[PDB]
Design a protein around this ligand. Structure first.
Ligand SMILES: Nc1cccc2c1C(=O)N([C@@H]1CCC(=O)NC1=O)C2=O
Lengths: 177, 233
């Protein structure tokens, strides 16, 4: 009975994506190190540049697709989700701008469960020195100026649709440039 | 023993065929089928080319890949240029399936023109539609994007219908070219679609050409090529 947001993947119905959002985080540096050591589950994502959960679900769908084909661009599923958010194919740049660093105070954790792979959510939440919030609070954490900066969203793109739609178009087609 | 990579690819193609199996068909082209479904909470269409039965499997895969890649590239070019066209959600190159936004409740320009002609018996009321199409295709060609299949069936009107919200679709035969001849052939396919599908709408096409010429600074050599390709049939 909780603040998590979960969705099944339509194309992979045995996979469920979970989103957890946190504010006032005080141990982001420890969290980043634990992710690199593999002692925290999920992708740690910078919510300041996340406009909508659909953006995450598109990135997650693609990551699972290439995971099962064995054709990921990055090393792990958790890095692949983060990489897929970026508008371009520079892996190091993507993981640094859409991942978390020690001077972040808001974190979005995204993980995927399927089959025997189960996440201990209570333990995960206990690792974050911060306050979990409902994803309803994402619009006050996302920074529209930073989003347009990272994505080079343009005036002609905004004239015909949402920022989200232009972002999704960039994400979904960057693998054929 | 089978290769794990090949086994994984077969499982992905099975997933795709299974997902498409229970969906409603919204469009049937020569090669392509378009189904409507849901993608992560959004109304979506999914476009795929099924093997026709008389061709080599490798040739079918090459064809599906080529047109899927071209369409994904064109739709990105459209969005970044402010040309209205469906958002791409996901492109599955294992199965050559394109998942994109459904333009919900829309009607084709073809159907809209035919309904107008059967209610009003006059094409006089289609002048605004023609001017809008002229502006839209001028912008597309000024981005050097050749649609490749420009008929009144590949333009949608997004509701509310009388706002004339044109949305371009079906870029599987598109390519990039600055050559006036390629742009001229593009317009020629559209002219033939007006002439054979919408008889007695020459004023409509005339107003289209007028608006296209106004809207694109590069229209003059394109319209000269349109004259030439018509002759060299
Ligand atoms: N071939 C494409 C390609 C992209 C998008 C669409 C199509 C397409 O046929 N439609 C119809 C239009 C009429 C409608 O209400 N719903 C649809 O599914 C599309 O939205």
């Amino acid at each position: 009975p909780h603040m998590q947001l979960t969705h099944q993947l339509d194309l992979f119905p045995e996979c469920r994506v979970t989103l957890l959002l946190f504010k006032d985080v005080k141990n982001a540096g420890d969290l980043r190190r634990k992710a690199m050591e593999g002692t925290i589950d999920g992708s740690l994502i910078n919510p300041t540049v996340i406009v909508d959960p659909f953006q995450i679900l598109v990135a997650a769908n693609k990551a699972v697709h290439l995971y099962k084909l064995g054709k990921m661009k990055t090393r792990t599923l958790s890095t692949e989700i983060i990489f897929n958010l970026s508008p371009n194919n520079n892996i190091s740049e993507a993981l640094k701008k859409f991942g978390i660093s020690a001077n972040d105070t808001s974190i979005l954790i995204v993980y995927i469960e399927e089959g025997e792979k189960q996440i201990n959510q209570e333990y995960l939440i206990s690792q974050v020195e911060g306050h979990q919030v409902s994803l309803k609070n994402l619009p006050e954490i996302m920074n529209i100026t930073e989003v347009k900066k990272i994505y080079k969203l343009s005036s002609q793109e905004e004239s015909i649709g949402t920022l989200l739609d232009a972002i999704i178009c960039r994400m979904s087609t960057k693998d054929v440039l | 023993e089978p290769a794990p990579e090949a086994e994984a690819l077969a499982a992905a193609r099975e997933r795709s065929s299974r997902f498409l199996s229970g969906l409603e068909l919204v469009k049937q082209g020569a090669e392509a089928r378009v189904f409507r479904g849901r993608f992560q909470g959004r109304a979506a269409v999914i476009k795929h080319r099924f093997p026709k039965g008389y061709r080599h499997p490798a040739l079918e895969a090459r064809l599906g890949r080529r047109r899927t890649v071209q369409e994904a590239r064109a739709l990105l070019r459209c969005r970044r240029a402010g040309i209205s066209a469906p958002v791409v959600f996901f492109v599955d190159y294992a199965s050559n399936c394109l998942y994109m936004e459904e333009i919900e409740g829309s009607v084709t320009v073809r159907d809209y023109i035919q309904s107008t002609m059967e209610t009003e018996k006059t094409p006089q009321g289609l002048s605004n539609l023609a001017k809008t199409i002229g502006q839209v295709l001028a912008r597309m060609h000024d981005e050097d994007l050749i649609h490749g299949d420009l008929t009144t069936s590949n333009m949608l009107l997004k509701p509310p219908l009388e706002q004339l919200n044109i949305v371009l679709i079906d870029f599987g035969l598109s390519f990039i070219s600055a050559l006036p001849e390629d742009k001229g052939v593009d317009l020629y396919v559209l002219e033939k679609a007006f002439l054979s599908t919408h008889p007695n709408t020459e004023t409509v096409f005339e107003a289209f050409l007028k608006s296209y010429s106004t809207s694109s600074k590069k229209a003059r050599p394109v319209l000269k090529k349109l004259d030439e390709v018509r002759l060299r049939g």
